[PDB]
């Protein structure tokens, strides 16, 4: 069904979908790989400017995403795509009929996992090679050792070991020998998230319920655990800027910063993402920075900042709350109506079903802004008849706009859903 | 960053070092007793002589300053300077001045303390090295000229902006500015650090205690309109009252009692948090006035809580610790007190708790019911679980005497309750 | 010949020695195993002088190969150099009424 006149290029107004992003660095610059449907994007992090896009649309949606230094590892329907700057340049077909569920990179051993608990270990063709092309071995965790695979982690200072966190326990596999070298104890709560701590041999397991348990694989022992009931831990990250702090992003769109040394709650952040779209679908600290990237399923990718402590003596006791810093976002619904704004093909207004209308930039998307819904004051000075609380306007079923006299009076007319009247808008 | 901010940061690095005779003069005229001219034209040996005399007088008062006259008040303490030493040593010096101020924080209106603090200001430059700690030490004395001089000579951290407005004035700072300082949130975290330190060192007294307790009642007072600010105020102030009750002192226990009382009558709290407050109060309750004020906190807490599960009974551990720490005769005397506060939900819940657990002091329950005036739904709950306890337990003479008291006063509710549950 | 104690005090007085005060100041304050192993990872022995990161990891100029045990030991040591071990994990482990019930309820309830 390919065309001779046109050719698909990319998508505007979408920064996330619910798929967790992956962070990476090229020395000092940091880039973020976030999936957009059948495609992924690569943003900058110091400015959130766009770096790369996937040039080739994968025939399905990318399920798993990860990244080392200069190679991005996607997993759509059955294969691992290894791209460089978004350029489709290696495909890695697994030998299954299942769908690739998990994916992780460590050294000379790629570890994928298809949904029938089937781990695929691939070896690099050379130590100087850049991506795995050779199929090393194929492991599978049957139902007796543990539950379904929750995570494929690679803990620091472990010779070819892979932490298969399952639903019931934690397994350690030597991918060189293909052998399960350690089975952990069974945990009474189904693990949903696993994240390696900056301390040695210790993982955090955020289960169905609020119980971030600091488990040590050496002792085979749950050293610690943090109570945080009625909440599904959807992300865990560690402050690596120089302070013992943990961010727990629940599925309720919430974000909780704990200080571990005082064993206290530094801070809470309510409704940073929308629960119906999953809430906080991914939260990651910047490595060695007090900057936190929080992506939700609501087509939102925020980047908050911690300020340094203002107390001259206390510091981490009187530590600063998060300050709102730079974010990217778009519609939560598909766009209903669209319009261009000028002849230069530089801006497009987009009205969607979430009653929020957005001017997206076109050259570089750093100008994706919601049009302000804030009333001008009436000329008669009388009262306005309406509810005390605020709400957005109905979905835009008709629209017109001109640019003859722009910045002079109104230039957009929007006929909303089932109104005997049409609202005006200044671009 | 901008070069102005970089040079300002390196100036804050190079603050306490004198780079010329004028800046040396400014830091030498920075004093606590003398004015600028004589503070210029006097000498470290004179100030140290008066300082050693002042600190040996303080040693005569209490034996705590002997170690500081041994270490921080020596000829080496004269000949030493801060910038010529290393970071480990300057940290140990900060700890030593911290211990000294935590000891001398309770004699601020005394001239030997003024002289010793002035010598430490002009020698160890504490008024530019640790300012937050010094202000948290002598903050309770804001109506004093010694604190006014502290203000007029201090370089202020960026949090005390009310005192930055009130600096270099002839009037002492105000109670409103105190309410605003304690209304700032991170100042309360600095004060939680201070309260943790002074609780761990047991250097507390009634003036500072009453002062910051009044600041807390007035901040929750001005904040009685904003629910989210009150809710974010819950953890700090509750940790304060928790460690204040963990402390053994009766004054700190009564101050924490007042704090929980005002926070409950400003904020309808939760049942499990309220019962944990009763648990901690009952665990660290030791003295007589603490017991009386704690009984008042029990009554006020159980009255201010209202909802589904309003008059639910006390559990096993809580009720058993309640009868262990309190006497039926003491609470009977409290009911016989003429003031008669509204202990309605507490008394009903306590009677239903005894009816579940003990089933022995039915005479005591009878005296309670005839001493305090009750309310219709509470007596309804009493008649229901009393009918249930009469059906499980053997029919007792004092039990039917309670029933006959109900006949004398409102048999009709007993009739309605039996028609709903029974014959 | 060792010096006398009076001569040492006079030498402190004539020199301006702050070492005794430094000792008092630094002294006086506030007086009021594994569960599993791997035999292949034990018998493994890796080269050292192939890559610059292991050229950092080594300890001897002449040593070119070391076993997996000493390799992972130096690896965890340089991991310690990168990230120091903090107190909440190094020295903290969880494993009449109580007094910290408010603290526990405050940690568990928002």
């Amino acid at each position: 069904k390919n065309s001779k006149i046109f050719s698909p290029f990319r998508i505007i107004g979408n920064v996330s979908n619910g798929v967790p992003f992956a962070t990476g660095t090229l020395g000092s610059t940091f880039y973020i790989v976030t999936c957009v449907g059948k495609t992924f994007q690569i943003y900058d992090a110091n400015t959130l400017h766009l770096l790369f896009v996937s040039e080739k649309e994968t025939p399905s949606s990318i399920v798993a995403l990860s990244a080392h230094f200069h190679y991005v590892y996607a997993a759509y329907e059955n294969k691992v795509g290894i791209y460089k700057r978004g350029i489709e340049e290696h495909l890695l077909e697994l030998e299954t009929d299942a769908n690739v569920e998990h994916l992780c990179i460590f050294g000379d051993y790629l570890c994928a996992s298809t949904d029938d608990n089937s781990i695929f270990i691939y070896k690099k063709s050379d130590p100087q090679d850049k991506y795995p092309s050779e199929f090393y071995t194929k492991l599978t965790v049957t139902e007796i050792q543990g539950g379904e695979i929750v995570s494929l982690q690679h803990l620091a200072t472990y010779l070819n070991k892979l932490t298969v966190v399952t639903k019931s326990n934690v397994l350690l596999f030597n991918v060189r020998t293909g052998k399960l070298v350690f089975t952990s104890n069974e945990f009474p709560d189904q693990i949903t998230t696993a994240e390696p701590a900056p301390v040695l041999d210790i993982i955090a397991l955020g289960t169905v319920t609020g119980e971030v348990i600091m488990f040590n694989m050496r002792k085979g022992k749950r050293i610690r655990t943090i109570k945080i009931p009625q909440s599904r831990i959807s992300s865990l990250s560690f402050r690596t800027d120089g302070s013992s702090h943990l961010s727990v992003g629940t599925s309720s769109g919430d974000l909780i910063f704990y200080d571990l040394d005082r064993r206290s709650r530094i801070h809470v952040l309510k409704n940073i993402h929308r629960e119906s779209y999953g809430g906080v679908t991914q939260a990651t600290f910047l490595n060695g920075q007090p900057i936190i990237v929080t992506s939700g399923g609501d087509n939102s990718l925020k980047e908050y900042v911690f300020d340094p402590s203002l107390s001259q003596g206390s510091g981490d006791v009187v530590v600063q709350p998060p300050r709102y810093l730079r974010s990217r976002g778009g519609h939560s619904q598909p766009p209903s109506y669209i319009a261009f704004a000028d002849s230069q093909s530089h801006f497009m207004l987009s009205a969607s079903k979430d009653r929020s209308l957005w001017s997206f930039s076109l050259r570089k998307d750093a100008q994706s802004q919601e049009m302000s819904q804030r009333l001008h004051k009436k000329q008669d000075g009388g009262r306005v008849g309406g509810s005390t609380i605020k709400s957005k306007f109905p979905e835009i079923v008709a629209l017109a706009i001109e640019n003859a006299r722009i910045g002079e009076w109104e230039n957009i007319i929007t006929a909303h859903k089932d109104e005997k009247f049409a609202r005006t808008w200044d671009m | 960053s901008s070069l102005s901010d970089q040079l300002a940061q390196v100036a804050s690095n190079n603050a306490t070092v004198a780079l010329d005779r004028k800046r040396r003069q400014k830091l030498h005229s920075a004093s606590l007793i003398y004015n600028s001219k004589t503070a210029a034209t006097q000498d470290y040996d004179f100030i140290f002589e008066n300082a050693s005399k002042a600190l040996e007088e303080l040693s005569q008062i209490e034996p705590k300053f002997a170690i500081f006259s041994r270490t921080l008040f020596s000829e080496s303490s004269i000949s030493l300077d801060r910038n010529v030493q290393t970071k480990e040593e300057i940290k140990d010096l900060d700890n030593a001045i911290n211990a000294y101020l935590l000891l001398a924080s309770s004699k601020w209106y005394l001239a030997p303390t003024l002289h010793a603090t002035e010598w430490l200001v002009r020698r160890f430059q504490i008024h530019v090295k640790n300012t937050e700690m010094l202000l948290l030490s002598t903050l309770n004395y804001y109506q004093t000229p010694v604190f006014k001089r502290i203000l007029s000579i201090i370089k202020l951290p960026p949090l005390f902006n009310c005192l930055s407005n009130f600096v270099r004035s002839e009037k002492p700072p105000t109670a409103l500015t105190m309410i605003k300082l304690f209304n700032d949130m991170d100042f309360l975290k600095l004060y939680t650090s201070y309260l943790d330190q002074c609780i761990k060192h047991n250097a507390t007294y009634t003036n500072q205690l009453l002062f910051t307790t009044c600041c807390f009642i007035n901040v929750v007072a001005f904040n009685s309109n904003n629910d989210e600010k009150l809710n974010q105020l819950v953890p700090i102030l509750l940790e304060i009252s928790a460690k204040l009750l963990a402390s053994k002192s009766k004054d700190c226990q009564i101050a924490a009692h007042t704090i929980l009382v005002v926070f409950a009558t400003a904020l309808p709290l939760k049942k499990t948090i309220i019962l944990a407050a009763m648990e901690t109060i009952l665990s660290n309750l030791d003295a007589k006035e603490a017991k009386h004020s704690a009984l008042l906190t029990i009554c006020k807490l159980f009255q201010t809580l209202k909802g589904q599960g309003n008059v639910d009974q006390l559990p096993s551990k809580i009720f058993k610790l309640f009868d262990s720490k309190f006497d039926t005769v003491s609470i009977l005397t409290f009911l016989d007190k003429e003031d008669k506060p509204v202990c309605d939900k507490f008394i009903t819940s306590y009677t239903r708790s005894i009816a579940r657990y003990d089933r022995s002091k039915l005479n005591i329950i009878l005296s309670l019911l005839k001493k305090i005036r009750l309310e219709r739904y509470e007596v309804r709950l009493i008649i229901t679980d009393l009918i249930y306890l009469s059906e499980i337990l053997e029919d007792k003479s004092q039990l039917v005497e309670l029933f006959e008291y109900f006949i004398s006063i409102n048999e009709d509710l007993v009739l309605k309750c039996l028609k709903s549950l029974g014959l | 010949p060792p010096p006398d104690e009076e001569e040492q005090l006079l030498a402190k007085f004539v020199f301006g020695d702050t070492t005794d005060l430094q000792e008092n100041l630094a002294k006086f304050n506030a007086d009021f195993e594994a569960a599993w192993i791997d035999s292949d990872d034990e018998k493994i022995k890796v080269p050292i002088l192939v890559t610059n990161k292991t050229k950092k990891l080594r300890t001897s100029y002449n040593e070119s190969k070391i076993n997996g045990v000493h390799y992972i030991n130096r690896l965890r040591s340089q991991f310690e150099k990168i990230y120091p071990r903090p107190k909440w994990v190094d020295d903290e482990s969880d494993s009449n009424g109580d007094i910290n019930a408010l603290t526990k309820i405050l940690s568990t309830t928002y």
């Binding site: 660095t25 020395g27 000092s28 610059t29 940091f30 992090a45 110091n46 080392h68 990179i105 460590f106 050294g107 000379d108 051993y109 130590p127 690679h154 620091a156 200072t157 472990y158 010779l159 070819n160 060189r176 910047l286 490595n287 060695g288 920075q289 900057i291 900042v305 300050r323 810093l325 | 960053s1 960026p158 949090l159 902006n161 930055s164 407005n165 605003k180 700032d184 991170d186 | 292949d40 018998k43 493994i44 022995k45 890796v46 890559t51 990161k53 292991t54 990891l57 690896l75 991991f79 990168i82």
Partner: peptide
């Protein structure tokens, strides 16, 4: 005057990381 919280610019400094290529080694 109340306590000012003037915002400021941020900068992502150079970050150090671990080498999984150093962790994963070939067998003897």
């Amino acid at each position: 005057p109340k306590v000012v919280r003037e915002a400021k610019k941020v900068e992502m400094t150079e970050a150090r990381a671990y080498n999984a290529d150093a962790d994963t080694a070939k067998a003897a």
